Design a binder for this molecule. Structure first.
Ligand SMILES: *[C@@H]1O[C@H](CO)[C@@H](O)[C@H](O)[C@H]1NC(C)=O
Lengths: 9, 252, 31
């Protein structure tokens, strides 16, 4: 795969 | 980007990442031209041949990033899209003529050491700088090597020279309009360096010796990228009146 | 706008990046 680090607010 | 290198911190503060909400992935590049407006390529959003028609809710823009995958908290900024504006005469059936789009953010973004708008060229600047041989800069998180069928860890930068219109015309079967221009070294030069598909929509900038400012002369429309030829860019100044029309009519 | 094109960690600090000169040399010819 290729995961992007969770984020936001 | 192929044959480029890691961009320094804040070296391209206007660089924007078009992020696909789901599946979560890099969609394209883009640029910040004001606290509420992001400029990108139209083909990144719209392309019926492959029934691609992203709506505001399918995307997010991430500003001020360096690392491609990490959530750079207290550095990058994530914004939602209020509206998308594909140029009305974007020719996707023919040759991506007028391959350009505008995106209005929901809320204005605050500038920082990592977030800063790029300038759009005026007539003189375009006249002075858009000459064969002069070099502009390209940045993006696109692929690194020929798509074997790879990805960079951090934003990639590379400089490329503008190609003479005729030379470029003779290099492809595509009808290159006056709303596009080409960049890239000659195939013999062995001095490679180019933008790949993931870099499309990103900016092609030039630093003006007249005022020390960076201007976006083009948008990566179709880089001769990770291909086995020159890259094609949207002529920003030629499409300047449309850009201002949109930003003036829409937007506060 | 107005303040566009001037990088905080570069133009504003009077610092240059490792390759912008390649650009300027292309407009003049650096020899
Ligand atoms: C994209 O889909 C929207 C939302 O469903 C629709 O209004 C529009 O016709 C589509 N875009 C085009 C021109 O294919």
């Amino acid at each position: 795969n290729d995961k992007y680090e969770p984020f936001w607010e | 980007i192929v044959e480029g290198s890691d961009a320094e911190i804040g070296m391209s503060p206007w660089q924007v990442m078009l992020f696909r909400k789901s599946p979560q992935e890099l969609l394209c590049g883009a640029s910040l031209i004001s606290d509420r407006w992001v400029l990108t390529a139209a083909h990144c959003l719209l392309y019926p041949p492959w029934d691609k028609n992203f709506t505001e809710n399918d995307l997010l823009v991430r500003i001020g990033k360096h690392s491609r995958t990490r959530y750079e908290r207290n550095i990058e900024k994530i914004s939602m899209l209020e509206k998308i504006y594909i140029h009305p005469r974007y020719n996707w059936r023919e040759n991506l003529d007028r391959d350009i789009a505008l995106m209005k953010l929901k809320k204005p973004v605050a500038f920082s050491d990592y977030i800063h708008p790029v300038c759009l060229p005026d007539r003189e600047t375009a006249a002075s700088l858009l000459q064969a041989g002069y070099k502009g800069r390209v940045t993006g998180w696109g692929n690194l090597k020929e798509t074997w069928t790879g990805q960079p860890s951090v934003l990639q930068v590379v400089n490329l020279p503008i190609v003479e219109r005729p030379v470029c015309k003779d290099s492809t079967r595509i009808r290159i309009t006056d709303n596009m221009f080409c960049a890239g070294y000659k195939p013999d030069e062995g001095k490679r360096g180019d933008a790949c598909e993931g870099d499309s929509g990103g900016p092609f900038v030039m630093k003006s010796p007249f005022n020390n400012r960076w201007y976006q002369m083009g948008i990566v429309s179709a880089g001769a990228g990770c291909d086995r030829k020159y890259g094609f860019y949207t002529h920003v100044f030629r499409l300047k009146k449309w850009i201002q029309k949109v930003i003036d009519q829409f937007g506060e | 706008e107005a303040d566009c094109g001037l990088r905080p960690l570069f133009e504003k600090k009077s610092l240059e990046d490792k390759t912008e000169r390649e650009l300027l040399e292309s407009y003049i010819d650096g020899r």
